[PDB]
Design an enzyme around this catalytic site. Sequence first.
Site, short mmCIF file in Angstrom:
data_model
loop_
_atom_site.label_atom_id
_atom_site.label_comp_id
_atom_site.label_asym_id
_atom_site.label_seq_id
_atom_site.Cartn_x
_atom_site.Cartn_y
_atom_site.Cartn_z
N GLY A 30 0.79 -1.22 0.00
CA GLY A 30 0.00 0.00 0.00
C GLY A 30 0.82 1.27 0.00
N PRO A 38 1.52 -1.65 -8.34
CA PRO A 38 0.22 -2.09 -7.83
C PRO A 38 0.37 -3.10 -6.71
CG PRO A 38 0.71 -3.21 -9.88
CD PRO A 38 1.84 -2.23 -9.65
N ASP A 39 -0.58 -3.06 -5.78
CA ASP A 39 -0.62 -4.06 -4.72
C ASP A 39 -1.29 -5.30 -5.28
OD1 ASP A 39 -3.28 -3.40 -4.94
OD2 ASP A 39 -3.50 -2.73 -2.87
N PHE A 40 -1.61 -6.26 -4.43
CA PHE A 40 -2.40 -7.38 -4.91
C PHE A 40 -3.87 -7.30 -4.49
CE2 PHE A 40 1.53 -10.40 -5.19
CZ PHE A 40 2.06 -9.56 -6.17
N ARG A 41 -4.20 -6.51 -3.46
CA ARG A 41 -5.57 -6.55 -2.98
C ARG A 41 -6.50 -5.68 -3.83
NH1 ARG A 41 -7.75 -9.26 1.78
NH2 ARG A 41 -7.85 -7.40 3.11
N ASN A 106 7.99 -5.07 0.75
CA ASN A 106 8.09 -4.65 -0.64
C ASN A 106 9.46 -4.99 -1.19
OD1 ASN A 106 5.52 -3.57 -0.36
ND2 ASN A 106 6.23 -1.44 -0.16
N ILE A 107 9.51 -5.19 -2.50
CA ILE A 107 10.74 -5.56 -3.18
C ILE A 107 11.22 -4.46 -4.10
CG2 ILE A 107 10.32 -8.02 -2.93
CD1 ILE A 107 9.46 -6.00 -6.08
N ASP A 108 10.57 -3.29 -4.08
CA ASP A 108 10.70 -2.29 -5.14
C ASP A 108 11.85 -1.31 -4.93
OD1 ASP A 108 9.75 -0.49 -3.17
OD2 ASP A 108 7.67 -0.85 -3.76
N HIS A 125 10.91 -9.78 2.41
CA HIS A 125 10.69 -10.62 1.22
C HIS A 125 11.74 -10.33 0.15
CE1 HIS A 125 6.18 -10.74 2.56
NE2 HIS A 125 6.96 -11.49 3.33
N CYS A 133 22.94 -15.56 -9.53
CA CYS A 133 22.95 -16.88 -10.15
C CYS A 133 22.45 -17.93 -9.17
CB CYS A 133 24.37 -17.20 -10.59
SG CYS A 133 24.61 -18.92 -11.08
N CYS A 138 28.16 -21.31 -7.66
CA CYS A 138 28.52 -20.07 -8.34
C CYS A 138 28.02 -18.84 -7.59
CB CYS A 138 28.02 -20.09 -9.78
SG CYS A 138 28.41 -18.56 -10.63
N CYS A 162 28.46 -19.21 -15.47
CA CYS A 162 28.09 -20.62 -15.58
C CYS A 162 26.82 -20.86 -16.38
CB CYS A 162 27.91 -21.24 -14.19
SG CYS A 162 26.40 -20.68 -13.33
N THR A 200 -0.36 -2.40 4.56
CA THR A 200 -0.33 -3.86 4.55
C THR A 200 -1.65 -4.43 5.05
OG1 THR A 200 0.72 -5.85 5.50
CG2 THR A 200 1.04 -3.80 6.71
N1 LIG Z 1 5.71 -2.74 -4.27
C1 LIG Z 1 6.02 -3.99 -3.99
O1 LIG Z 1 7.18 -4.37 -3.76
C2 LIG Z 1 4.90 -5.00 -3.97
C3 LIG Z 1 3.77 -4.89 -4.77
C4 LIG Z 1 2.76 -5.83 -4.67
C5 LIG Z 1 2.89 -6.87 -3.79
N2 LIG Z 1 4.00 -6.96 -3.02
C6 LIG Z 1 4.06 -7.97 -1.91
O2 LIG Z 1 3.35 -9.11 -2.29
C7 LIG Z 1 2.70 -9.68 -1.12
C8 LIG Z 1 1.21 -9.75 -1.37
O3 LIG Z 1 0.77 -8.43 -1.75
P1 LIG Z 1 -0.66 -7.87 -1.34
O4 LIG Z 1 -0.84 -6.59 -2.06
O5 LIG Z 1 -1.70 -8.91 -1.48
O6 LIG Z 1 -0.44 -7.60 0.23
P2 LIG Z 1 -0.16 -6.35 1.19
O7 LIG Z 1 -0.14 -6.86 2.59
O8 LIG Z 1 1.02 -5.61 0.71
O9 LIG Z 1 -1.49 -5.49 0.98
C9 LIG Z 1 -1.50 -4.09 0.61
C10 LIG Z 1 -2.42 -3.35 1.56
O10 LIG Z 1 -2.30 -1.93 1.34
C11 LIG Z 1 -3.59 -1.37 1.17
N3 LIG Z 1 -3.47 -0.21 0.30
C12 LIG Z 1 -3.22 -0.20 -1.04
N4 LIG Z 1 -2.97 0.99 -1.53
C13 LIG Z 1 -3.06 1.82 -0.42
C14 LIG Z 1 -2.84 3.20 -0.25
N5 LIG Z 1 -2.51 4.03 -1.24
N6 LIG Z 1 -2.95 3.71 1.00
C15 LIG Z 1 -3.27 2.88 2.00
N7 LIG Z 1 -3.50 1.57 1.96
C16 LIG Z 1 -3.37 1.09 0.72
C17 LIG Z 1 -4.45 -2.50 0.64
O11 LIG Z 1 -5.81 -2.21 0.94
C18 LIG Z 1 -3.91 -3.67 1.46
O12 LIG Z 1 -4.51 -3.67 2.75
C19 LIG Z 1 3.10 -8.77 0.05
O13 LIG Z 1 4.27 -9.24 0.72
C20 LIG Z 1 3.38 -7.45 -0.65
O14 LIG Z 1 4.20 -6.55 0.10
C21 LIG Z 1 4.99 -6.07 -3.09
C1 LIG Z 2 6.27 -11.58 -1.71
O1 LIG Z 2 5.34 -10.95 -1.22
C2 LIG Z 2 7.09 -11.03 -2.86
C3 LIG Z 2 6.58 -11.45 -4.26
C4 LIG Z 2 7.08 -12.85 -4.63
C5 LIG Z 2 5.06 -11.37 -4.36
S1 LIG Z 2 7.21 -10.23 -5.45
C6 LIG Z 2 5.73 -9.28 -5.91
C7 LIG Z 2 5.93 -8.26 -7.03
C8 LIG Z 2 6.68 -8.85 -8.23
C9 LIG Z 2 6.66 -7.98 -9.47
C10 LIG Z 2 7.51 -6.72 -9.40
C11 LIG Z 2 7.42 -5.87 -10.66
C12 LIG Z 2 8.74 -5.25 -11.07
C13 LIG Z 2 9.37 -4.41 -9.98
C14 LIG Z 2 10.79 -3.98 -10.30
C15 LIG Z 2 11.52 -3.41 -9.10
C16 LIG Z 2 12.98 -3.09 -9.37
C17 LIG Z 2 13.66 -2.47 -8.16
ZN LIG Z 3 26.65 -18.72 -12.16
#
Ligand SMILES: NC(=O)c1ccc[n+]([C@@H]2O[C@H](COP(=O)([O-])OP(=O)(O)OC[C@H]3O[C@@H](n4cnc5c(N)ncnc54)[C@H](O)[C@@H]3O)[C@@H](O)[C@H]2O)c1
Ligand SMILES: *C(=O)CC(C)(C)SCCCCCCCCCCCC
Ligand SMILES: [Zn+2]
Lengths: 285, 6
Positions: A30, A38-41, A106-108, A125, A133, A138, A162, A200
């Site tokens: 979020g 984008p989130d997943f919810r 988040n992974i971003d 995560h 690799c 390796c 490799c 979250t």
């Molecule tokens: N940016 C990223 O790295 C990224 C993106 C999508 C999913 N994921 C990861 O994947 C897994 C599953 O993702 P998920 O989206 O189902 O779970 P999550 O626990 O990350 O859920 C996101 C939450 O944020 C809320 N939300 C969304 N936008 C908002 C905003 N602008 N302000 C306030 N609240 C907001 C949603 O209602 C939800 O409750 C999690 O570990 C999540 O962190 C990471």
């Molecule tokens: C667990 O919650 C982690 C996941 C396995 C769900 S990763 C979820 C998002 C994967 C797609 C990311 C899109 C590209 C982002 C590029 C970031 C570069 C820094």
């Molecule tokens: Zn390698």
Amino acid sequence: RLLDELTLEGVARYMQSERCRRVICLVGAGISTSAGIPDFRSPNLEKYHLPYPEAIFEISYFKKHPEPFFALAKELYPGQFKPTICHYFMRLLKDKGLLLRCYTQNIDTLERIAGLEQEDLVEAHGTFYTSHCVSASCRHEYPLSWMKEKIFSEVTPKCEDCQSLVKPDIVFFGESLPARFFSCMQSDFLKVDLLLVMGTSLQVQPFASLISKAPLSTPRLLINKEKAGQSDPFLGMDFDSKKAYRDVAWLGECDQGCLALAELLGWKKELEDLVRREHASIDAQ
Amino acid sequence: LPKKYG
Ligand SMILES: NC(=O)c1ccc[n+]([C@@H]2O[C@H](COP(=O)([O-])OP(=O)(O)OC[C@H]3O[C@@H](n4cnc5c(N)ncnc54)[C@H](O)[C@@H]3O)[C@@H](O)[C@H]2O)c1
Ligand SMILES: *C(=O)CC(C)(C)SCCCCCCCCCCCC
Ligand SMILES: [Zn+2]
């Protein structure tokens, strides 16, 4: 109880009291939706033709077919990486000596871009920032510029030493979380004065269990579009019971919640100046 | 170590 009232205004007064010295942030998808990730919810994964939709983020399937995941990363790769007001709010917590740790789902990499250091972060995560690799013998490391280029070229990333697959340093569903997550969790919550939970749904485990590790007196503020973390009436945060004493829910967008809290703390100008300056720098780069 | 689930 430590909060004088179960409101944002109560939290802000507590944060500027002598008791509030160590803040832990717990953040999820979020906090990055306003940065274009984008989130997943919240209410696009059919082109991949998977056995079941959630297989694209499961390690069993990635190991068998990594192509769909990398094709998705290409589709989602942002044009720019601009951290949000929420990210820069945590930068302010760091600047002011209040941030003990940011645990992120988040992974971003936006927490790093916003200026949180490795020591400040538990990327629970993993992260796209580094890739490795997959061959145990390796494990050559590669930076994002290398990985982005292979994602864009639509060429599955292969190790140059490799020729094994190179995988972003992320934790797929079904993979073990990093040792650092468990080590930090076993020490950080001994003396934490405030949990700030943002963006979250508190459904992914074991991350979600982090809220239960603070002392029972520690206030917990949730800034989130929806109430999360409450116990399920079938299968926690207590905002509304007659026993409620320390948990506060601010329902809305993370950016707007952090702006409102900053303003109560007298940081509104600091936060606006910081975000505008950082975004202007990223645009200039 | 414990696995990511949910
Ligand atoms: N940016 C990223 O790295 C990224 C993106 C999508 C999913 N994921 C990861 O994947 C897994 C599953 O993702 P998920 O989206 O189902 O779970 P999550 O626990 O990350 O859920 C996101 C939450 O944020 C809320 N939300 C969304 N936008 C908002 C905003 N602008 N302000 C306030 N609240 C907001 C949603 O209602 C939800 O409750 C999690 O570990 C999540 O962190 C990471
Ligand atoms: C667990 O919650 C982690 C996941 C396995 C769900 S990763 C979820 C998002 C994967 C797609 C990311 C899109 C590209 C982002 C590029 C970031 C570069 C820094
Ligand atoms: Zn390698």
